[PDB]
Amino acid sequence: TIINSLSIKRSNVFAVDSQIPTLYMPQYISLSGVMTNNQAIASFEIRDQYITALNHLVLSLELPEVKGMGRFGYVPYVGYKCINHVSISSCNGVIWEIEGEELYNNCINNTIALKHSGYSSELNDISIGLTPNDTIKEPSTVYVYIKTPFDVEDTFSSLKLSDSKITVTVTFNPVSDIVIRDSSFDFETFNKEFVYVPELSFIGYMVKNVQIKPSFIEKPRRVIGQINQPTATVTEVHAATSLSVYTKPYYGNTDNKFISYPGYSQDEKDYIDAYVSRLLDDLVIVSDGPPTGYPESAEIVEVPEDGIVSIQDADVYVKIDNVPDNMSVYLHTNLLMFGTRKNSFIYNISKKFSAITGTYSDATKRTIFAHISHSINIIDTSIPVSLWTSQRNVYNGDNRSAESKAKDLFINDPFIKGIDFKNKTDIISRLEVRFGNDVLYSENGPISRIYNELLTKSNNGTRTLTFNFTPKIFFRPTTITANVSRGKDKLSVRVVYSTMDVNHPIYYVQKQLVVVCNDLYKVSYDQGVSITKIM
Amino acid sequence: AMNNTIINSLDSIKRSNVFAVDSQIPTLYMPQYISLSGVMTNDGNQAIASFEIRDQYITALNHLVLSLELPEVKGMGRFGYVPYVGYKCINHVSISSCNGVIWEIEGEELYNNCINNTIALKHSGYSSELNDISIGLTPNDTIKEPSTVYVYIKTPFDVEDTFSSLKLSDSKITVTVTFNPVSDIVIRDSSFDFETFNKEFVYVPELSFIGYMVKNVQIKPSFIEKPRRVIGQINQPTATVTEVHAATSLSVYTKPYYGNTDNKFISYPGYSQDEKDYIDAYVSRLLDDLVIVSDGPPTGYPESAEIVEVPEDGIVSIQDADVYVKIDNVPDNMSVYLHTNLLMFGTRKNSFIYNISKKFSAITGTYSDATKRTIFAHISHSINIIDTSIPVSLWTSQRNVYNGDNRSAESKAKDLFINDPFIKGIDFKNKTDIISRLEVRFGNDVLYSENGPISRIYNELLTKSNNGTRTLTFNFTPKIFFRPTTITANVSRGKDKLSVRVVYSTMDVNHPIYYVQKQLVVVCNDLYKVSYDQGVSITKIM
Amino acid sequence: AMNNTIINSLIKRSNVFAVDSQIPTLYMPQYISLSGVMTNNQAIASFEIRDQYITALNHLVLSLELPEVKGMGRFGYVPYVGYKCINHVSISSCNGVIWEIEGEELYNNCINNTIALKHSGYSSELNDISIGLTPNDTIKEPSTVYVYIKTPFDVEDTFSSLKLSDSKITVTVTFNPVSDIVIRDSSFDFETFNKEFVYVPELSFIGYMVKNVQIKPSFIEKPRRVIGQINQPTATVTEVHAATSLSVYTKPYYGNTDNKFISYPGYSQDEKDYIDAYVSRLLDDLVIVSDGPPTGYPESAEIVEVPEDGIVSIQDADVYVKIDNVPDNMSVYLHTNLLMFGTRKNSFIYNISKKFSAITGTYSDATKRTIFAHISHSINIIDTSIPVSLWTSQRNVYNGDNRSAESKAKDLFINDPFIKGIDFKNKTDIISRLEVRFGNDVLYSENGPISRIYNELLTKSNNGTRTLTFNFTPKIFFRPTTITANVSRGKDKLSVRVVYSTMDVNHPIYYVQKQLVVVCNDLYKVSYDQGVSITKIMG
């Protein structure tokens, strides 16, 4: 019966003519560099007569042993966060360069690349050293994959350099960015003694009778707008393949100090749970007589026999078992509060708790919490302490114990986007992109970001206008092209940020609009490597 | 720097250049994300949204994403959304032109096509904000906050991006979406005012797509696979697909039919959707009634219930079954009781018994003086995913010679209606496989037979999905660039048909799951030709 | 409507908006399963594939019926049980072998295939250590697992398929001893299990009925592996004439041990999971609540009563122990040398008890046992991967295993054949320097694992190996780029030298034997003139 279901020319899908390729030989080449210092710059010169092509740059980084006292840990993906800039240049000048946060953005979907850059509990959990000669973190090496457009189709897209001298340059962020630390930590010494120790590897190709043809290249150019200004403009846009827009926070009006940090565990729930844990130290107190050692502005109340404390309309159920007879259960009813006028709405972190149950330990003399019912969110965990106690706040603001406040952590991670530590909250309410002075694209919802995430299979997308839907390398990229006489040589982005009540500390986080334009360049090989901005 | 060992190993042959490419110039186009509001009709009385795409400068399109605004939910009761709510709103999608339907899919088959796309799934609505069962306490309590979800209508026009795009230059395309009843996409208890909710709820859709404006487009015809689904009669282990002339694939699976029930269940895990999560939720709900600490016999259980005091050694023997219960810090005036027949089923008056209490072996915990409740520490049990998937109706069916549901009234109050339209198998995780043998017949000849789900193994293996189906794939030829390889269900030897026969596993007449009715679903992908002569038109290959 | 600015912004050109749908070869695929012949020393299954209507095949999937396991004791299956059953696979024709792979290399090839791994057996039903209580109690239910025998014939689906038109193909599978795939305690009757156990396999594949097939030759990579002698940091691969890649890794050798370990996490295979199972097993003896000094421990044990202070000092190391709700007639004791190792008396000591910082918990009056709340410790993956044998080694001047007899009874034999490194997660990297010589000249040397970094990076796998990849050319459509021999200059061999990093002679892990593994992928030419044959390229 099958013989029934089975004249004309047909393409063979059961055999292929195995073509003989170019004769080449690859080699993983590692090379130490020159480190020079203001900011730290590593330079790697690649000049070898027998290296014909290269791609897949990996910068390795040896992190020191960290000994002393205080709490200290590394930002996630520390390797990528070390990099402020990378430039690939020849004797004819720059071939390609990228900003560190955009390199991170391009590799943010490479899970293996991310893990190699430094993502472990050994690196990213906040360790604590107890003696001035105690070891906080052990020495370690991380690997940063410098993704470049020369890796896209491997040998085909490789950087050709036969009889050219190419120099890879890495500018490093201040070590302050890649470190999360306590006050007790001697950052002053650390900053002083720490140096970047880098080494650049690449896959080099020795090619016999190489046939060089020109190619095309995309270079992301980044523009940051002014603080709290909701627009940014990219000039000299003649051949752009895509345009991405995102917001980033500006923490310069603060001390960059936050109450809680989860460590290696970076899920939204983890960020929340760590916060709740730090708050719970002061939120529920078991003591003999009214608790001591809180600001006078604190309003710590004894829990009634019903177990319910009413903070305005908010009811909080607190039940601790095995409390000593001489002790009572107290609730800090305004652990953190913010208000801009005396007759305003008030943001009170204690009101975000509904139920706190646990058990007192006679042996260890502390409370062990069992079930916490609350409505703490990712934003609460991302509020700089400074904002709780800003001049705008008519209250004291920070009513924590000094013991709690001491454990606050400085975080200066340079790649934060949004207003929360997970980039969860979307604060762009409307988006308008103008090419010249005409509106090119507008949206009320984040449909450009939905398509971004959808089209790239990523959970970390951005509002992105992609103009190239053409397979890269085998075709000249499709671009939005400029008319210079009509004035269309600029891309202006303007947003309308989403509105919220002025009595939330997060309202006072300063915002910066980031616009990234991918310009098309042509890579030429007449008398060395050279690039040319398509116009 | 390059080792000299390499330099030596490196004349007279033609070689392909593998270090450079000749960049071809592509068709001149410009893409644009276009969104569209639509026309809403509640006559079909189902709700239907229609979107017309007619623009001279839109030459081609692909990647349809339908957005949906979910409202604020205020009131009293427990309420939540099924996971991937957006996909569960869709009962049907049709893409049609002036010459008629070009492509249409059933809502459940769109979902099946998108199950390995985790991003498409997250976008459709998957969060603890959306899918955890929230509770309102006052008639003005907010249960759910308003939200927008985006559902990716995967089409054959997305497969090869611009190449597979639907060309429509000089045609008017209409996308029509039929919506399932909102009852399907909602999980709620009895306290919730669904009657009002259902009345006030409206679907608010908006269709986006990637539009392509092409200069001097050179249009060529292509081919399209259309999934056609057939559902067999209730509890019948056969289904037949007719008019099969050019099938690229054939998929088989089962669905439960809960129409003989109220669709109410004892427990639901919420956002956490792991098999372990479904079980843990169930055990948690039972434990409220399974072990009681009271002064004197517990009260407010049916007279049918058999609550026993736990002996000093901790062991209650329920027939052949032993259950170890030890609760710490019990008051002196109180005792520890075990509900020994929380849920039980039997078909004859003194025969075998399926009794949920007997599936626990160990229960330990500590009584809390402050909260006047027991906190469990470790539960050893043998509850499975099937137990968590039994409609309550079946516990109290006429077929049951016992009372059946001997839980407290308080427990029964927390039961939840679940009407998710895309359930497969007989449990909520589609874990239990009830097909023992599968046969596909074209006429009297067998085309394929299997004892294990090796067709599903190949399915998941070849498509990198952890959620596959028993699938006979006939086309292994690269799509879009080749005409798909198809099987024909003959034409001359009578009718042109594929009939599927399965052998269901045999199950106990005293387990409730026996009475969950099952339906066999067969899905056939027919090959169609998409022609663009004088507008877009399709033709079933025959 | 396209926004107005776009419509304004818009030579030979390639069409990217329609394509010429070509008519492919006329074929018909069929999922074929095949029971085989079973042969026994080693267990061998054979499958012959000869059919008038099967022209080509690819995607071999081996089925495995696991029996019901009834009886008493603790028993479980290694993760990816299906892959761990396979000791060798060979595909051969009347002209001889076409392709063959060792079980561990097939596994390595699929280790980033999450579905293939899941299909082979990765579940709590399979990989959690269940316990049987009655001689007729069910420990494990019957189950089927599916093993994807990835071959070079799957790279490009129909294009790379093995053509067998008018040939008899034989797939042969050699099975490891079932001892390898099972994790069990002493109470389990392995003796009966092993006698009654049989491998029940079935080979499936995708077959193609092809009308007028036009066969052309192809190329194939065959992974050949060389294992070095125990603890030897060199190995050599001879007759290297056209290699596409070269990989190096380490394995432990547990022949000096009974293959018994104190703890196993079960299905939960995260490194933290391994540690928690260990710490959990230790805590049974580590903190004891009894009326008067604990009983039933070796006389060698040093159990001390915990002071009212709560701090017990074991040499420089302090251990804070506080258990709530301890009965009045009972005290809290700390076992201060649960496991200890030393090679000389009055020397350094490796003491597992000194690795705990804090132990808090609460005693249960109802169940007469302690429930631990918080453990501060520094147990690491290595501690969890030490054979019990090594604690009670002749090298040890101490007793070593001062655990209760109850504890020691619960220890589990593990004989998983694909363990890498010296710890159960391959976490510790013990190669400090790597040198590869082609002939006698140095081809590659590295001081960090940059070759592994690149391996993982280029293959999107988090389980890579130090690997020298020579072929960066797309498979199937091109002849693979190879490193080529100069047999004339002696350059027909690949020699690997490592410098293992050394460890403290007072840690038990120093005494775990290690083996160097080298895997060479040789290029062969597949021709189909008068049946299928392969030919080793000798450029």
Ligand SMILES: COc1cc(OC)c2nc(C)cc(N)c2c1
């Ligand atoms: C869209 O870009 C393509 C498409 C293809 O098929 C239509 C290709 N096919 C082969 C064999 C090789 C390629 N580089 C290739 C690239």
